[PDB]
């Protein structure tokens, strides 16, 4: 294929578009880029390990990868205390070396390997219009994805377990012996409203549900992989979809935008797959923690926190949710759907329980609430912690803030890319992506509007 | 041929005075619903307890507001992020008191504007155009989504969505600055560059085209009549415009390719607005503007003020007064 504008029709700034029909070069680009991803995983892990002070919390040190490893149950014990630093190092080293291998392969295919693969092999050669081959590649990758989900399941069940922040006796790494395979729970998660108090799938709150849903995901992905290997797209799919490389790219871009938004919300709200031990409190958690901290302090001072009415007439410390549940008062009324391992022991069937509040509060809960209140996910861009009017002496931005902001931004720009490529794929399939033909300008053959 | 096929040809018809299309089949109902509810509420909605402290705020004209002060008030802080449709209220009066109209209008409006963007793509496809006008429109859509949905989601309440009113908009902005220092956020600076530069480039482009108009009229009639709709020839001399501009600054800073020029005109404000929309969307997660409070110390250790410290003083002044009865505890975390 050509490597300039005259021979390709694409400028340098759209040079990767020149690869659309060079399957070998495209494969090289993909493999090298995968090498970039794995390289970042390894290098960032080693950086985080090197810059890790293991007696300080992870979320106080700007770490986003080490929490992922800790959640999987590696190198941590009860309450998230880092037992062994070596497994983090091993994850990083393995990713770095494998990235070397992937980069070598991507360079080979991009620079010297065969330009196209179709006259080399039918198995690896593909045509974008070859619907059966495209569904074959879908099938292979679906099988792989289901296998990866089952790898998560195997780690949680047979290889030491995963970190369970809801464990009795304290959050700890525990082995999940009874995943919920019950499809009612698993698929009723997908039907929950994406609004406050329901939290469509962000509300999954126990590792049994997570592991069981991953068993279901693995089975679904593998069976769909086989289904796509053994069939071709049906008539309705053929009549509804654009069948081109750019169209498939646009479809994947839409999917990725959806996943990016979901991940940003997930890290912002969920404290089960993102234990606060490693990611710090959620904003909801920190607000509730402040309310709890001052309930505890004022109660020790002698305030009768059940009957103390605030300035507006609502309870200063306790109040009712619009459905009647007893909740913390103040602005944190909006966060009454929050559930956390440190707060549920004080919750009764009706909400917060006066008897537990008056005699069941443990010193570790007070310490945890103070920590979470002071590590609220508020911070400046230059990493000054606290409310924006605070002064420069607290260097902290929550990992939840970093992850949520970054992935909302990436989700948005991938929605933009999906719009761009979907529109372009449609126009190119219909053949007017290069502009209006003067001879057959469609609007010239149309009746005037009025 | 078939009834469904006939309906399809009608909806996707390019001969309709207003294109409907499949995105239009969602846009029209949702936008009409939002408009009717907005007008009704703006005129006649009763006061809304936005802060969830039984402190209702009058937003409608009939309850003492003018056009500037009137608004559709965001739903109650007690609701938070809960879905509050009409059928979850004990009565219409309860729904009104808790700010249900805001949720109805906002949700329908958001669906409508996303469908408007899809409809722009659809009509471009039906007319044989290039497909990317909707990409430009995605910038205002991103900004509106940031202020009506994303920011309330990150903050955890639709009470922290932008009110549907003029003064409500100003209140939103002032509180936002107090809590996030949006002025000192580089994405908002990029938004300001986007709009200032977009207006600048609009003024230059319009003035350079108007300046280089080919003489086709007399001094009496409007020069606008020198252009005939659908004429093939060019109505201005782009070469003269390039000569003027390349001598105003220097030759190589002036576009002589109209296509590159118009791409630049499209791209600058759109990119700026994308950046500012992302700025609001990320300040939704309290990743705030720069904090240089007490960044400059003298040798002894006393703080030397900068303009950032004066700005922080203004922010604190806004911060301590806003929602004066809503806070019970020392830190404004919610």
């Amino acid at each position: 294929g050509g490597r300039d504008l005259p021979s390709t029709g694409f400028a340098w700034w759209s040079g990767n578009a020149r690869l659309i029909n060079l399957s070998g070069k495209l494969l090289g680009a993909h493999v090298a880029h995968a090498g970039l991803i794995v390289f970042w995983a390894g290098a960032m892990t080693l950086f985080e390990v090197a810059h890790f002070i293991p007696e300080k919390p992870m979320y106080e040190q700007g770490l986003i990868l080490l929490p992922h490893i800790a959640t999987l149950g590696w190198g941590v014990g009860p309450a998230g205390e880092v037992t062994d630093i070596f497994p983090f190092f091993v994850v990083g080293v393995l990713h770095l070396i494998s990235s070397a291998v992937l980069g070598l392969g991507g360079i080979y295919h991009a620079l010297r390997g065969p330009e196209v693969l179709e006259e080399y092999s039918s198995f690896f050669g593909y045509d974008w219009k070859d619907k059966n081959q495209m569904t074959n590649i879908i099938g292979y990758h679906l099988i792989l994805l289901g296998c990866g989900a089952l790898l998560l399941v195997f780690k949680a069940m047979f290889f030491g377990g995963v970190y369970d922040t809801w464990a009795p006796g304290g959050g700890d790494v525990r082995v999940i012996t009874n995943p919920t395979l019950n499809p009612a729970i698993i698929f009723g998660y997908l039907l929950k409203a994406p609004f406050g108090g329901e939290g469509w799938i962000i509300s999954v709150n126990n590792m049994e549900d997570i592991i069981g849903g991953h068993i279901w995901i693995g089975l679904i992905c593998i069976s769909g992989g086989i289904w796509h290997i053994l069939t071709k797209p049906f008539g309705w799919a053929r009549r509804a979809l654009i069948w081109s490389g750019e169209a498939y790219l646009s479809y994947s871009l839409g999917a990725l935008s959806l996943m990016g938004f979901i991940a940003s919300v997930f890290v912002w709200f969920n404290n089960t797959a993102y234990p606060s031990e490693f990611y710090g409190p959620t904003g909801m958690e920190a607000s509730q923690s402040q309310a709890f901290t001052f309930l505890v302090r004022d109660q020790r001072l002698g305030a009768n926190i059940a009957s103390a009415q605030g300035p507006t007439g609502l309870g200063k410390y306790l109040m009712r949710s619009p459905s009647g549940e007893i909740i913390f008062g103040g602005e944190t009324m909006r966060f009454w759907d929050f559930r956390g391992p440190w707060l549920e022991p004080l919750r009764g069937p009706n909400g917060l329980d006066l008897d537990k509040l008056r005699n069941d509060i443990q010193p570790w809960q007070v310490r945890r609430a103070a920590e979470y209140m002071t590590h609220a996910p508020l911070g400046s861009l230059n990493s000054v912690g606290g409310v924006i009017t605070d002064v420069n002496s607290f260097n902290y931005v929550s990992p939840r803030a970093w992850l949520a902001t970054s992935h909302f931004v990436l989700g948005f720009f991938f929605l933009v890319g999906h719009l761009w490529h979907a529109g372009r794929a449609r126009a190119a399939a219909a053949g007017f992506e290069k502009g209006i033909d003067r001879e057959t300008e469609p609007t010239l053959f149309m009746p005037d509007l009025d | 041929a078939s009834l469904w096929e006939q309906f399809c040809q009608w909806v996707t018809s390019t001969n309709n005075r207003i294109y409907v299309g499949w995105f239009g089949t969602l846009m029209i109902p949702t936008l009409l619903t939002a408009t009717t509810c907005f007008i009704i509420a703006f005129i006649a909605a009763p006061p809304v307890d936005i802060d969830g402290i039984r402190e209702p705020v009058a937003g409608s004209l009939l309850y003492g507001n003018n056009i500037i002060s009137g608004a559709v008030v965001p739903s109650s802080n007690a609701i938070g992020l809960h879905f509050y449709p009409i059928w979850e209220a004990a009565s219409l009066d309860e729904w009104l008191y808790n700010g249900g109209p805001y949720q109805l209008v906002v949700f329908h409006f958001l669906i409508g504007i996303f469908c408007y963007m899809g409809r722009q793509w659809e009509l471009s496809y039906r007319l044989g155009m290039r497909p990317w006008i909707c990409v430009a429109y995605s910038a205002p859509v991103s900004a509106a989504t940031a202020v009506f949905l994303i920011y309330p989601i990150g903050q955890g309440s639709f009470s922290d969505g932008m009110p549907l009113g003029i003064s409500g908009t100003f209140n939103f902005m002032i509180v936002f600055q107090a809590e996030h220092n949006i002025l000192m956020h580089p994405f908002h600076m990029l938004g300001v560059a986007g709009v200032f530069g977009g207006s600048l480039f609009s003024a230059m482009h319009g003035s350079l085209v108007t300046s280089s108009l080919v003489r086709e009229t007399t001094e009496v009639e409007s020069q606008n009549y020198g252009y005939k709709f659908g004429q093939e020839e060019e109505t201005y001399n782009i070469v003269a415009a390039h000569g003027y501009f390349g001598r105003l600054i220097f030759q190589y800073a002036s576009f002589n390719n109209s296509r590159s020029l118009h791409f630049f005109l499209g791209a600058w404000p759109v990119i700026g607005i994308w950046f500012t929309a992302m700025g609001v969307s990320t300040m939704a997660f309290n990743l705030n503007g720069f904090n240089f409070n007490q960044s400059i110390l003298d040798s002894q250790g006393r703080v030397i003020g900068t303009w950032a410290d004066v700005l922080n003083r203004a922010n604190i002044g806004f911060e301590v007064m806003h929602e004066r009865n809503a806070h019970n505890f020392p830190l404004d975390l919610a």
Partner: peptide
């Protein structure tokens, strides 16, 4: 009664919109 004035001006703007769309001067190619 200033509500009447506000409603009046808003309705004037909306009526202008409907007439400007429905009864616009048709663009004609000539």
């Amino acid at each position: 009664m200033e509500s009447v004035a506000y409603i009046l001006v808003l309705t004037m703007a909306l009526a202008v919109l409907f007439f400007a769309i429905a009864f616009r001067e048709p663009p004609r190619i000539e």
